[model samples]
Target chain A: RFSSACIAFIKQWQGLSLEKYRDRQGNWVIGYGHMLTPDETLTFITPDQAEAFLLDDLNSCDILLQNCLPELNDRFQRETLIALMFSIGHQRFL
Target chain B: RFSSACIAFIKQWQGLSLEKYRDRQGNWVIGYGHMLTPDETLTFITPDQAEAFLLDDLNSCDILLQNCLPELNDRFQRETLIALMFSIGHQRFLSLI
Candidate 1:
């Protein structure tokens, strides 16, 4: 789990959006770049829900980074990479 | 500088008290064991004030620990010692020497 500071840092860069908005690729996104599925119909969410979505998204990013970069050990560097991966799509990051 | 997690951990153990209260030793303490002087008239403070006080107190503790134990290199160990010093007076920790 990331510290509150790290979460805050990521959130600061990502920005928060309670209402769903279309991304550059025309996909529905909400709450710190959380991609919405076709089955999902959430129009808006609370800040807590936004944070939950952010954490869930970050978890996948963390897993991907760990698997691909097993040698990375420094906490700060790992977190920075995760934040970068979050900002850029995982496909692009990899 | 301590990480937010470290700050939260210390705050969790120390506990927050906005109002001044006397410690077991009868000293006026407020905002995570911050000692108060007779001249200070602060009755209560915000959470921000409490955190500020905690950081200030921890800064002194960090300085003392670094001076006394210059060889301490591990971040976790150094933070643990600083947290311990925050809980107990620095004099007792130095006296352990």
Candidate 2:
């Protein structure tokens, strides 16, 4: 679950990207750095769509954190970790 | 921190033992199933002392949880995970996934 503060933090750091482009790692990413799925095809999206994609991406991070560390109890700590995971991906964090 | 509900939950499950005894694993343990340290030498303790030991042991679990999963925010989830880790140990849970 992304709190408004967490969402705002991600938006600030991730910024906005309406058009799909290759990231530094060469993966095709779209709005808010949402990595594209093999079956998905999208050239462009609006600000609202970008936000939706961000939330969707964050949901995956939330689930991973929940399974791996269900004992986390602090709001600020949770938000910060989620933001980091969103940017760097969960592999390094896990 | 040991919430009243958490302390109660542990008390109900772990019960109380005033005298030190060997556990299933052969470790010397005391009140509320607290594993004794190598330097610790105690034949007996009061119920209050046992409760204090339990709280102290729980603090270690809390620290481990904080370091491993700082994103945990749900109260019930946190309590449940801590309780499980308290019983089975953190190593098992960490290796689970």
Candidate 3:
């Protein structure tokens, strides 16, 4: 699937977290970009759940690809864009 | 068996390795202190293998404990010694323990 390359790219870029932690902006993020309640203290999930959360997030990434690059279903280019989106926000990636 | 707490402590202490790289001494170390061939390059192993390397290293740790602290099988103290051994060498650990 297209997600394999994108996921690998994201892993190579974002790194993995087995624990809830703050991002550079102090956001309470966990599990491959899933956000948590600011007041939340602790959360934990297995690596499998992390993969699921990332896969779910890609549904959104796919939409951006469909809208922005409707004619470009190219896997490599799409993977590149998704990797960028995973790092920067969607608008910034475009 | 005894590797759980030791592994956790080691992981917490040594951290994890997803790629092979050199340590502070410029030695080519991989996994959890599994030294690669001096001139060898491009070594890779999954996290599972990394854990295995750690387990194997602990086998040696067990021998050190048996020889150094033959009567100290207590988990907490043994784990403490293992953690120290992971950082320092066996001889240093023996002197300290």
lDDT of 3 at A46: 87
Question: Backbone clashes in each candidate structure, one number apiece?
Answer: 0, 1, 0
Query: What TM-score would chain A of each candidate receive against the reference chain A?
Result: 0.84, 0.84, 0.73
DockQ, candidate 3, vs. native dimer? 0.01
The C-alpha stretches of model 1 lying farther than 4 A from their native spots are A90-94, B1-97
Q: Which candidate ranks first by DockQ, i.e. highest? A: 2
Residue B90 C-alpha lDDT in model 2? 18
TM-score, ranked from best to worst = 2, 1, 3
Candidate lDDT values, in order: 0.67, 0.66, 0.60
Candidate 2 lDDT, tens digit per residue, B1-97?
A: 6689988887766767799887545667788877778689898999889989888877765655443333444566657766865654311112232
Number of clashes found in candidate 2: 1
Question: lDDT: which is higher, 1 or 2?
Answer: 1
Error of 1 at A93 (Å): 20
Ranking by lDDT: 1, 2, 3
* TM-score of each model, in listed order: 0.46, 0.47, 0.41
Question: Candidate 2 has what TM-score?
Answer: 0.47
Tell me the lDDT of model 1 at B34. 81
DockQ per candidate, 2 decimals: 0.03, 0.04, 0.01
Per-residue lDDT of model 1, residues B1-97, tens digit only: 8756557655534557789887667778787768877798998988899888878887887787788889865444555456545544511111222
Worst 10 residues of 2 chain A by lDDT: A85-94
